[PDB]
mmCIF file of C-alpha atoms and ligand atoms in Angstrom:
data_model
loop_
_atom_site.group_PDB
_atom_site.id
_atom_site.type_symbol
_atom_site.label_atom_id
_atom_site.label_comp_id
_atom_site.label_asym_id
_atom_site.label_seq_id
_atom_site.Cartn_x
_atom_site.Cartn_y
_atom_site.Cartn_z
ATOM 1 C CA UNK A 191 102.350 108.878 126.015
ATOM 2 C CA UNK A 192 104.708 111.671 125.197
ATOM 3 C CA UNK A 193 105.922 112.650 121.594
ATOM 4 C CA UNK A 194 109.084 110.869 122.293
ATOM 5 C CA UNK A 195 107.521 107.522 123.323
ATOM 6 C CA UNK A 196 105.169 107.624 120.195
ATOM 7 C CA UNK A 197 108.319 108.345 117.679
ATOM 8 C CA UNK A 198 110.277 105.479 119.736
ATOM 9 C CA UNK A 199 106.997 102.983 119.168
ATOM 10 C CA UNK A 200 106.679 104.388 115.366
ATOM 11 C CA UNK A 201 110.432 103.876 114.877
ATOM 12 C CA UNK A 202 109.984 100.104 116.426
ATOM 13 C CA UNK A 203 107.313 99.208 114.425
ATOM 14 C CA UNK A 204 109.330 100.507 111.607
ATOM 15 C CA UNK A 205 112.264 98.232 111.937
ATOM 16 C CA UNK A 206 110.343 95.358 113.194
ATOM 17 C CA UNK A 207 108.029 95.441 109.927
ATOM 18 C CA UNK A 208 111.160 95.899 107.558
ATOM 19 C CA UNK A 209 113.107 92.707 109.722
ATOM 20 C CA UNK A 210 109.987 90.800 109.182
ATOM 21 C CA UNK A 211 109.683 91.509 105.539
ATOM 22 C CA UNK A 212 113.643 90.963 105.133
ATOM 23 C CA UNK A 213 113.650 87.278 106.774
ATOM 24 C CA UNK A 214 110.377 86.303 105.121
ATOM 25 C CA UNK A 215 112.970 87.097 101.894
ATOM 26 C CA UNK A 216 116.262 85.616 102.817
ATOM 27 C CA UNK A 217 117.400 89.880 102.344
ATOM 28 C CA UNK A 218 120.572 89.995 104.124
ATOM 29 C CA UNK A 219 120.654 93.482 106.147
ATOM 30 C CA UNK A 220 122.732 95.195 108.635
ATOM 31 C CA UNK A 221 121.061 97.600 110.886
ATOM 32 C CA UNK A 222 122.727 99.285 114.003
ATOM 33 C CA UNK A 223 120.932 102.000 116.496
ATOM 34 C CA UNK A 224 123.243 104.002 117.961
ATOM 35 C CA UNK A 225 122.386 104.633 121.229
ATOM 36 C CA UNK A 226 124.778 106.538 124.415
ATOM 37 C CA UNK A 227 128.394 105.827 122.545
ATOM 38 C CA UNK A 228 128.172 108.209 119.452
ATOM 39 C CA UNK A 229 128.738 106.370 116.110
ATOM 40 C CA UNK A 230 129.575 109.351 113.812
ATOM 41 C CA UNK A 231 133.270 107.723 112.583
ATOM 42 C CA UNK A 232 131.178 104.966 111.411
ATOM 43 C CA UNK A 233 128.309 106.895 110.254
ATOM 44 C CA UNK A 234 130.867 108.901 108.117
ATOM 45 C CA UNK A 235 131.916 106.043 105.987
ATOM 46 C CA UNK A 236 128.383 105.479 104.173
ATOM 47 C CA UNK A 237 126.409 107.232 102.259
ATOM 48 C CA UNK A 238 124.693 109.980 104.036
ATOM 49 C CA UNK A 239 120.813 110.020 103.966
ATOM 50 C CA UNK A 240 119.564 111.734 107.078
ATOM 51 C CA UNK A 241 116.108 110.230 106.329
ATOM 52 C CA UNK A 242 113.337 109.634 108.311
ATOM 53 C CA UNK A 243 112.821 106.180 109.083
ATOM 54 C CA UNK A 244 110.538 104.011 107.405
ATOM 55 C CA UNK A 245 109.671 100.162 106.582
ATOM 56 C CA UNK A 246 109.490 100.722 103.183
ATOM 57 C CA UNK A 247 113.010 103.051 103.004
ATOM 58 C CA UNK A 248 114.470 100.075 105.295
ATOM 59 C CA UNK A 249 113.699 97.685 102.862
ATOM 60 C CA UNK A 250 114.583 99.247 99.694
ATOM 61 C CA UNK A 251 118.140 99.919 101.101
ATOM 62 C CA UNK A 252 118.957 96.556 101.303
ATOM 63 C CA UNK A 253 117.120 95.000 98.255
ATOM 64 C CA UNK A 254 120.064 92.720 97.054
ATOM 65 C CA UNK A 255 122.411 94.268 93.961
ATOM 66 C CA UNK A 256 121.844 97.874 94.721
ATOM 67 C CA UNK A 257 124.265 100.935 95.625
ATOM 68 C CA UNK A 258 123.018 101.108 99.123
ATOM 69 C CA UNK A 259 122.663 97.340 99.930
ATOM 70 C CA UNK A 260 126.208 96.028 101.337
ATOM 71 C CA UNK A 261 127.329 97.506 104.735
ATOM 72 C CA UNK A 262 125.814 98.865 107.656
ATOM 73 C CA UNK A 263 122.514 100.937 108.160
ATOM 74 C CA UNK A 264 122.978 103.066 110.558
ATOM 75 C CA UNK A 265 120.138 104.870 112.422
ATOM 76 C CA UNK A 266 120.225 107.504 114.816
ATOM 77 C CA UNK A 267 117.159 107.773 117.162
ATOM 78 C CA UNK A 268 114.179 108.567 114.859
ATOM 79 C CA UNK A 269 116.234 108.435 111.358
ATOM 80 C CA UNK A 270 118.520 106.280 109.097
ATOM 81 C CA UNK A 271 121.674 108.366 109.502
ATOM 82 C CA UNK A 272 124.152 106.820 106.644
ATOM 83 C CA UNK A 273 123.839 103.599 104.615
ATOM 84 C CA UNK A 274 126.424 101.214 103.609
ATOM 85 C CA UNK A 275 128.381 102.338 106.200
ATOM 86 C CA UNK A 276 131.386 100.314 107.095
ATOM 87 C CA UNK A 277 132.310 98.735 111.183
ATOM 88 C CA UNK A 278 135.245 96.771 112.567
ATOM 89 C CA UNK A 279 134.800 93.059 111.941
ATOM 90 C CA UNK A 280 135.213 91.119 115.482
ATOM 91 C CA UNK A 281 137.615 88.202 116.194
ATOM 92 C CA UNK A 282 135.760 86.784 118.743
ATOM 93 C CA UNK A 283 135.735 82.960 118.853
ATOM 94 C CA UNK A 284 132.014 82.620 119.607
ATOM 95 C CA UNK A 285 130.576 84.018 116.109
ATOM 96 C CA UNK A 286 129.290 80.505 114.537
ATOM 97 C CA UNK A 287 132.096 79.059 112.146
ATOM 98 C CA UNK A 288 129.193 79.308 109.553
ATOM 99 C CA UNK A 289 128.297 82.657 109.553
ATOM 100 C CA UNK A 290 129.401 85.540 107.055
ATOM 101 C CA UNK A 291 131.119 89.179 107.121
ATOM 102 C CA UNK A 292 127.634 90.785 108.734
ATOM 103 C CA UNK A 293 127.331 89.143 111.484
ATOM 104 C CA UNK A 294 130.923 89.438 112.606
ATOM 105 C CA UNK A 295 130.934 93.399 111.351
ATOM 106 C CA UNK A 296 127.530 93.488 113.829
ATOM 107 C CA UNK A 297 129.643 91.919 117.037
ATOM 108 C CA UNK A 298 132.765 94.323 115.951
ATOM 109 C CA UNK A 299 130.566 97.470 116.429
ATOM 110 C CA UNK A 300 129.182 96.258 119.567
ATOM 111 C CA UNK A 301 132.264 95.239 121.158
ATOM 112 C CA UNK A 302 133.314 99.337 120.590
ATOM 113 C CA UNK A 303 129.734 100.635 121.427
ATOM 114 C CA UNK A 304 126.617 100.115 123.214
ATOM 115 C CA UNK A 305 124.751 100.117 119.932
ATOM 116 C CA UNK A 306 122.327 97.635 118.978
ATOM 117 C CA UNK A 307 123.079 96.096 115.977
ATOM 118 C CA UNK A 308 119.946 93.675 114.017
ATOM 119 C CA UNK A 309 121.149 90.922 111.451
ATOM 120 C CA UNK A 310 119.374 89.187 108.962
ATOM 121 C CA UNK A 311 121.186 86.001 107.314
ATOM 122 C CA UNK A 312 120.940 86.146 103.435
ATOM 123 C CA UNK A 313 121.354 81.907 103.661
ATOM 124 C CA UNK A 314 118.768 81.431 106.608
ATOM 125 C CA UNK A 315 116.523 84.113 106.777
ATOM 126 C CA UNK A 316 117.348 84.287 110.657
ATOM 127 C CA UNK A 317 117.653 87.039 113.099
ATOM 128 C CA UNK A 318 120.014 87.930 115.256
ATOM 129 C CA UNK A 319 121.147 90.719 117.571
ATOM 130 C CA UNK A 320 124.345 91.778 118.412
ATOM 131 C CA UNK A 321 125.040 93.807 121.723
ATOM 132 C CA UNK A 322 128.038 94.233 123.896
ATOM 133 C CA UNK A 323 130.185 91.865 122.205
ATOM 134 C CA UNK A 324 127.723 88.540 122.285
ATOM 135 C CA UNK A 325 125.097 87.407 119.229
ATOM 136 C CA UNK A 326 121.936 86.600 119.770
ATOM 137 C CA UNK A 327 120.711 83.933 117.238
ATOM 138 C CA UNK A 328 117.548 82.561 115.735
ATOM 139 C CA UNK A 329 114.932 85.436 117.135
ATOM 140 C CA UNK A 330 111.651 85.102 117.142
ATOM 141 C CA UNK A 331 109.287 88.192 116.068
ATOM 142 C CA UNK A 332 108.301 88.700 119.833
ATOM 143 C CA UNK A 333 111.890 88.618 121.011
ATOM 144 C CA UNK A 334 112.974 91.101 118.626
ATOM 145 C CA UNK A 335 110.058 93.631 119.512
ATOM 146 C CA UNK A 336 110.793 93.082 123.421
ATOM 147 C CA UNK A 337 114.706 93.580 122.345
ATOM 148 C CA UNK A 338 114.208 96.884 120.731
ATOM 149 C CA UNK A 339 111.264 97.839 123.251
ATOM 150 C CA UNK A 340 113.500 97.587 125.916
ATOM 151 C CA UNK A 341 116.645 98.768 124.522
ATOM 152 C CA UNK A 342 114.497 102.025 124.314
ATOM 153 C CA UNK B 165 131.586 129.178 93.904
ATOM 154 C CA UNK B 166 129.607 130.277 96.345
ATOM 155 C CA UNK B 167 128.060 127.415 99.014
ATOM 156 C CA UNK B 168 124.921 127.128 97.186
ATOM 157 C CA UNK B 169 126.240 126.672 93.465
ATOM 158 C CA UNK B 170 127.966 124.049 94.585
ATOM 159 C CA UNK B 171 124.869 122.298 95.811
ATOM 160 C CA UNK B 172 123.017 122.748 93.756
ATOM 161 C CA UNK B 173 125.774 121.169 90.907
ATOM 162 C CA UNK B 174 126.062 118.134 93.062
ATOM 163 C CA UNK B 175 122.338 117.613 93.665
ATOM 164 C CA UNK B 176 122.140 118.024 89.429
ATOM 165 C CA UNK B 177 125.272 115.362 89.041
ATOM 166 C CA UNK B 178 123.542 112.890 91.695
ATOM 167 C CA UNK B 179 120.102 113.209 89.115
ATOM 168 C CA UNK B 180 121.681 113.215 86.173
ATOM 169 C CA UNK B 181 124.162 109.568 87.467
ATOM 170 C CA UNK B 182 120.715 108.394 88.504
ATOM 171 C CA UNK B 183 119.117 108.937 85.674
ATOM 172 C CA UNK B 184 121.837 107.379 83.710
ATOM 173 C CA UNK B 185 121.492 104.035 85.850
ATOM 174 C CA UNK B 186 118.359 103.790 85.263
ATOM 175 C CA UNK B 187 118.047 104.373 81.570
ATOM 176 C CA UNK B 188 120.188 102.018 80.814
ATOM 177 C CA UNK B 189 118.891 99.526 82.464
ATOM 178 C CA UNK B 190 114.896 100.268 81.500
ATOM 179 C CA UNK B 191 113.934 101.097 85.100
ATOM 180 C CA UNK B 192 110.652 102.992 85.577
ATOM 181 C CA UNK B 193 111.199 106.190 87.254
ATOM 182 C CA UNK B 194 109.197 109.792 88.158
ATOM 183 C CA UNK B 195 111.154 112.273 89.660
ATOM 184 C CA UNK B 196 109.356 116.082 90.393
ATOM 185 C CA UNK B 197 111.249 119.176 91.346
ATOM 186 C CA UNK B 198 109.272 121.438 93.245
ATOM 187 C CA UNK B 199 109.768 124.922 92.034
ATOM 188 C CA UNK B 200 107.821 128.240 93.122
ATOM 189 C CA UNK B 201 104.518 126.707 93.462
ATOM 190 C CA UNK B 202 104.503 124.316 96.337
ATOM 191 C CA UNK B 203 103.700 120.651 96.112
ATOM 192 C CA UNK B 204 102.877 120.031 100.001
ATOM 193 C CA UNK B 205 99.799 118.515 98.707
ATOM 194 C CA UNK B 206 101.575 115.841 96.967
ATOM 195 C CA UNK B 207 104.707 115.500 99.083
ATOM 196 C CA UNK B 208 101.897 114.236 101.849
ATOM 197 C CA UNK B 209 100.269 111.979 99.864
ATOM 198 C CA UNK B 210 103.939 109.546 99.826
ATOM 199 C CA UNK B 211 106.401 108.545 102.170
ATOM 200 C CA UNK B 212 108.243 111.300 104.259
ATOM 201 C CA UNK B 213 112.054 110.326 103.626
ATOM 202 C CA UNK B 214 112.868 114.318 104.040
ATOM 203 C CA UNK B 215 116.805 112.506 102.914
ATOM 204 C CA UNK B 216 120.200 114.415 101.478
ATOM 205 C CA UNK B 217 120.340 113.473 98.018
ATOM 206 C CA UNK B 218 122.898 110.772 96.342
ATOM 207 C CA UNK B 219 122.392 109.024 93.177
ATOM 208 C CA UNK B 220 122.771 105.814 95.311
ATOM 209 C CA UNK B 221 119.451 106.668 97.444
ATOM 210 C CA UNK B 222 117.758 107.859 94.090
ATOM 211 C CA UNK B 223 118.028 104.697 92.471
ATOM 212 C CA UNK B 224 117.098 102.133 95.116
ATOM 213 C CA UNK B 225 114.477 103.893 95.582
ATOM 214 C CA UNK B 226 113.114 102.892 91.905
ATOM 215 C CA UNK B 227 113.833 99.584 92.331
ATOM 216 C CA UNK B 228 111.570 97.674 90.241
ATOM 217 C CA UNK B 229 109.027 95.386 93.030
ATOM 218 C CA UNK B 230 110.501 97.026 95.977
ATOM 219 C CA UNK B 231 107.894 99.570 98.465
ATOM 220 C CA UNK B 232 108.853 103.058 97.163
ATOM 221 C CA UNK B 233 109.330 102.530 93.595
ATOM 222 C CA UNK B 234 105.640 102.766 92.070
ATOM 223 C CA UNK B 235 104.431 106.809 92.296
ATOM 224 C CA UNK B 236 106.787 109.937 92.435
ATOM 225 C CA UNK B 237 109.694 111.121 94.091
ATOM 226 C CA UNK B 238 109.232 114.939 95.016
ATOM 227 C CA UNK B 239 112.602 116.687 95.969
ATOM 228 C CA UNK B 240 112.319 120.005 97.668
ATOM 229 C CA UNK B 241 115.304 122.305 99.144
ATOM 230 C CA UNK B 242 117.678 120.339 98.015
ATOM 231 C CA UNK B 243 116.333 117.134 99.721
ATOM 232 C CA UNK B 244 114.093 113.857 98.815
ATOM 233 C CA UNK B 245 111.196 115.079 100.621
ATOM 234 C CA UNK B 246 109.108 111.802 99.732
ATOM 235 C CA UNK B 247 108.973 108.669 97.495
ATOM 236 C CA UNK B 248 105.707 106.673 96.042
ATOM 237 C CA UNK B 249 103.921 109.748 95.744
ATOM 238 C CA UNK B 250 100.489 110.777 94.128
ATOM 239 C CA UNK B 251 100.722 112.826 91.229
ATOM 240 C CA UNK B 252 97.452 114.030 89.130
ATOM 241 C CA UNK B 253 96.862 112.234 85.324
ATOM 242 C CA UNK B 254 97.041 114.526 82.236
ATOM 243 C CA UNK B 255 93.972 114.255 80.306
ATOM 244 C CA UNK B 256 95.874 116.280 77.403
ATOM 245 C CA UNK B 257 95.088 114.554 74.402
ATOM 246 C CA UNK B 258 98.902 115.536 73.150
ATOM 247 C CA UNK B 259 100.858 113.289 75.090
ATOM 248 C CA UNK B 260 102.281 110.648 72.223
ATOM 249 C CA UNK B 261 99.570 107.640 72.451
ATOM 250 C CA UNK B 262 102.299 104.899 73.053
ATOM 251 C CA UNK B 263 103.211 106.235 76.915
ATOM 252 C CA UNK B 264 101.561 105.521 80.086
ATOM 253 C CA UNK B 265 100.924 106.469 83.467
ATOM 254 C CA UNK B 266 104.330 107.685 84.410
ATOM 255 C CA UNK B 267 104.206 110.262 81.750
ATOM 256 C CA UNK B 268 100.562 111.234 82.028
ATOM 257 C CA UNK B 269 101.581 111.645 86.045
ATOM 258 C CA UNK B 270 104.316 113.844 84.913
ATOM 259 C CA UNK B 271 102.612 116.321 81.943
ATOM 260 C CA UNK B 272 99.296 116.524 85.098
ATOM 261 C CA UNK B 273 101.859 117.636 87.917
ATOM 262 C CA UNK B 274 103.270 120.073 85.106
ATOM 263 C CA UNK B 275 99.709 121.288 84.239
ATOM 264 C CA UNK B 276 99.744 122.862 87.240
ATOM 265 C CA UNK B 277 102.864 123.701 88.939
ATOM 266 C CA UNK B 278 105.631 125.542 87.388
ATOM 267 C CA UNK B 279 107.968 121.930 88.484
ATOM 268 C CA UNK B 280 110.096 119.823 86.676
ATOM 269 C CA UNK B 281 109.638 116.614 85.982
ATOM 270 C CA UNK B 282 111.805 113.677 85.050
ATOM 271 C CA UNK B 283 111.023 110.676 83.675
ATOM 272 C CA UNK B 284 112.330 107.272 82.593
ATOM 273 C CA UNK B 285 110.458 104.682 80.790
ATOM 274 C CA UNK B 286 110.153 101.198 81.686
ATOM 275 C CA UNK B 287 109.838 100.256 77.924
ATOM 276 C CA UNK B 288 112.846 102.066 76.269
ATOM 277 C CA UNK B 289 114.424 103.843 78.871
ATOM 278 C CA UNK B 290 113.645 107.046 77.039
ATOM 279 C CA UNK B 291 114.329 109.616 79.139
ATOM 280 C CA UNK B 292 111.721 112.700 79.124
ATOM 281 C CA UNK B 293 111.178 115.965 81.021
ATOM 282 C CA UNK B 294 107.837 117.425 81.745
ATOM 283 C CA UNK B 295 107.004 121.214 82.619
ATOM 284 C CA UNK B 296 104.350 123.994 81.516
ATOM 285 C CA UNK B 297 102.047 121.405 80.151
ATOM 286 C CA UNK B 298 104.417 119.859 77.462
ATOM 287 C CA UNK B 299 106.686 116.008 77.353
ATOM 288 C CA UNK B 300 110.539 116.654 75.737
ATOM 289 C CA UNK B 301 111.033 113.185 74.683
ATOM 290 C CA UNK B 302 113.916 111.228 74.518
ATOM 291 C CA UNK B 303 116.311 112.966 75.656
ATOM 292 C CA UNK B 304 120.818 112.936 75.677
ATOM 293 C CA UNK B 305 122.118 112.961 78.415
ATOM 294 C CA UNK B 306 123.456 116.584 77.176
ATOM 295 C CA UNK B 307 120.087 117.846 77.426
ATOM 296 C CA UNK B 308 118.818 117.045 80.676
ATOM 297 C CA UNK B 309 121.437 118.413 81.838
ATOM 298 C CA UNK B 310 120.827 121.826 80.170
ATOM 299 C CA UNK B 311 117.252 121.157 81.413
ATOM 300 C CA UNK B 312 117.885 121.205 85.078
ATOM 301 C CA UNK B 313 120.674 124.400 85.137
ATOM 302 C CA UNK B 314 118.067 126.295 83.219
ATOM 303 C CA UNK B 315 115.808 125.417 85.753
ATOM 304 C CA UNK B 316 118.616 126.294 88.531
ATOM 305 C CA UNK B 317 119.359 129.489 87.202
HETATM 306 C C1 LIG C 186 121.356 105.373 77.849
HETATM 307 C C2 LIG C 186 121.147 106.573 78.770
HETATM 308 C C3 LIG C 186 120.836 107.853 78.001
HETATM 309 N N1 LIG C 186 121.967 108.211 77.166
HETATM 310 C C4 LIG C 186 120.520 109.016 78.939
HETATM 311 C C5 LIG C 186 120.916 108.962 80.265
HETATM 312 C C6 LIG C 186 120.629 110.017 81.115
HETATM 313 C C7 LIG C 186 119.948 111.124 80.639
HETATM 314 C C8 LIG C 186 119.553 111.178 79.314
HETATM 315 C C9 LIG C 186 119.840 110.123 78.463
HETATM 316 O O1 LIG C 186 119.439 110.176 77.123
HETATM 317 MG MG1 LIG C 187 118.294 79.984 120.504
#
């Protein structure tokens, strides 16, 4: 394939393996990929890291009761752009009663953006996605891939 | 100051807060500062993060149990170039007989590159500095400090 498609597979496998790892853990996480709609008011808020993304720097943001753990990830393309970045919280009605501040920070930013925004519940271990304003629960491993494969 | 003093001041205050964190709280850590002779060797043998430096990254990163925290961070230009990296064992029979790995890995990488080397034991959160072959144990805060802007200068 080209350069590109190989980074965009590396980068998937990345996040996948890091999600995976994360649930497995009950490790709450926050992860949005900007993608057409730039993010850099957001990305400003955090903690600037410009890093090159990996499983293992994925995970060790979020390990709970560290500086970089509460608030967004943020990655642009091929890196992790900012950590513990902050995003609008959304009001919408159809964010389960249940659910905590990540999961309604994730449908905020993608009410505002076409990002893609991964969740991991800290009480469940599930997955969900959040993109163009709706949350997408309970994900399997293959339905996150085919998410993030498609979403390019 | 000029652009680059002032980096290089905040890249020593995001160490040194680091470093603080950590000793105080016993948590293992290895940090090398490539100098004039280059460490590409090593830097490949880790993790690319190629990251800004903050004193938040540097201490998740050491996390005890967590991927990146067992082998050395190398920072070059100013940046984390990579974590959980491979550094080479002294065999000097002068490092004090009570320290392990982490400081053996630190005196080696010394042995042979004109870097500086931080580290922070798991057992006392001692901190030390290797470079040129020789361990400056347990250091004040004071002194690291002095350590790195001599090594900035
Ligand atoms: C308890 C931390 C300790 N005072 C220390 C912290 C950072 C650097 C050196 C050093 O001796
Ligand atoms: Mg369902």
């Amino acid at each position: 394939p080209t350069p590109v498609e190989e980074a965009q597979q590396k980068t998937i496998e990345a996040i996948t393996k890091a999600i995976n790892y994360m649930a497995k853990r009950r490790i709450g996480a926050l992860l949005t990929i900007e993608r057409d709609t730039g993010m850099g008011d957001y990305i400003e808020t955090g903690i600037p890291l410009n890093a090159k993304v990996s499983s293992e720097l994925l995970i060790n943001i979020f390990i709970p009761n560290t500086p970089l753990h509460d608030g967004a990830v943020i990655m642009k393309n091929n890196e992790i752009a900012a950590a513990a970045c902050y995003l609008p919280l959304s009001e919408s009605p159809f964010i389960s009663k249940e659910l905590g501040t990540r999961h309604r920070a994730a449908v905020g930013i993608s009410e505002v953006t076409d990002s893609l925004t991964i969740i991991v519940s800290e009480e469940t271990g599930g997955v969900s996605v959040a993109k163009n304003g709706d949350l997408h629960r309970e994900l399997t491993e293959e339905a996150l891939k085919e998410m993030l494969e498609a979403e390019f």
